[PDB]
Amino acid sequence: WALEDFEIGRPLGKGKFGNVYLAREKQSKFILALKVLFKAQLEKAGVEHQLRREVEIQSHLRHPNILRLYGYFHDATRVYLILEYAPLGTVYRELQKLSKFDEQRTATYITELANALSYCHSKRVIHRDIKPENLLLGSAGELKIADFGWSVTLDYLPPEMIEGRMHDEKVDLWSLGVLCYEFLVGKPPFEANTYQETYKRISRVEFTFPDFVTEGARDLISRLLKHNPSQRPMLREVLEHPWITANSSK
């Protein structure tokens, strides 16, 4: 692949490393998104090798609820990512438009996200925290995880220094809890006017529900937002949750 193979359209985002544009392959006329990253900006932040690894993992993930990376190429100065175009944009814009989502739309979104996370678990691929700005919508309204957050002397070392990352798979369970609350309420559960107060609310797990949040939704969110990561449910338990099975379309 080379830049000349693509016709460029409007910008779809401006970042620290580079920009994203709507594009189309000149020959096939296939609509996609091209993200440009500057090699020197990546090397300055020490994320160059980290990008190579995430891009390698992202290349082999094929799921309706994960934004597809069709490929990548580079020239002497830039790295180019050929990504799926999600025509309905970020779920954050849809949340601003509707104020809050009903229980069916929320449960369906949670299902899609847990499905994408379960598909990755089976490939021993782990995901970090999920933000709504990093969730895009396909034409058939399917949510898509669109971030670059995928992961895959001895005698004197303690078990915690040799065993490796123990509960990194449990960060995204907390994310599902935050997102399920945000989708139903219209705001994240630990929101506060200061950083210190937001920090305190998260650390003390201090959240309450407005009166309109139903008992089933309260049960799932309370099981996801556990201080102790090992006490958060497995993804299969989320997919089998009675509030999820009663309200999800998928």
Added chain:
Amino acid sequence: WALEDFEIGRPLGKGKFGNVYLAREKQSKFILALKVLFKAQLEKAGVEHQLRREVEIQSHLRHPNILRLYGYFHDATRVYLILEYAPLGTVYRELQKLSKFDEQRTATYITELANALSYCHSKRVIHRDIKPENLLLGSAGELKIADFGWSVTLDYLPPEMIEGRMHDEKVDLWSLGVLCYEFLVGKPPFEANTYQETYKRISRVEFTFPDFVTEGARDLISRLLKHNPSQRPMLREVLEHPWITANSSK
């Protein structure tokens, strides 16, 4: 400080970044050790900034059981560390010479190490794993910790991603347990012919004592070698341990 201020003696160690030499300040005739580190080798391993930080922390630590860093300087290519000279060298060589240490010598060493670790705790300075090759002996036989191992969007983050390093202060408690066993037995507790078998023995906390290890020493080692870091004792509990208070000269 500059290199010309020092007379150089014999080498005291050859490393990846540079070498260590006995030295003496030309004017005062004060005996010390000079460690040379090559800036380009540090930058190649991405440890340059990490050295700056540890050297800054090490500069303000003054304790009889911590190897003193009197100062540091640099030229265009190298970093120089002015260190205390510990005439009796590494405790590892003494352990090879004696085969194993008696209970008084072991309890006194543990006391010195826990004292150095407690002094650092009070300054909110944390230490990593301790190896016998990194423990030096002063002329009056005091043990000295001689390593460079000292340490000092929000809405969507889980408590484990915002709270910071939780039990890093508990790595050195496991180290005291390993060292206390090594000092009394003559070999580390999880030693095995393969890496995989050593890995298994540490992870499963599989250790046994030869018949000569006394009950008091067994009690302290068993309390230190806990799989769960939060269950390891506080440093004050080690210093107040009845086996320690009965056998330590300090």
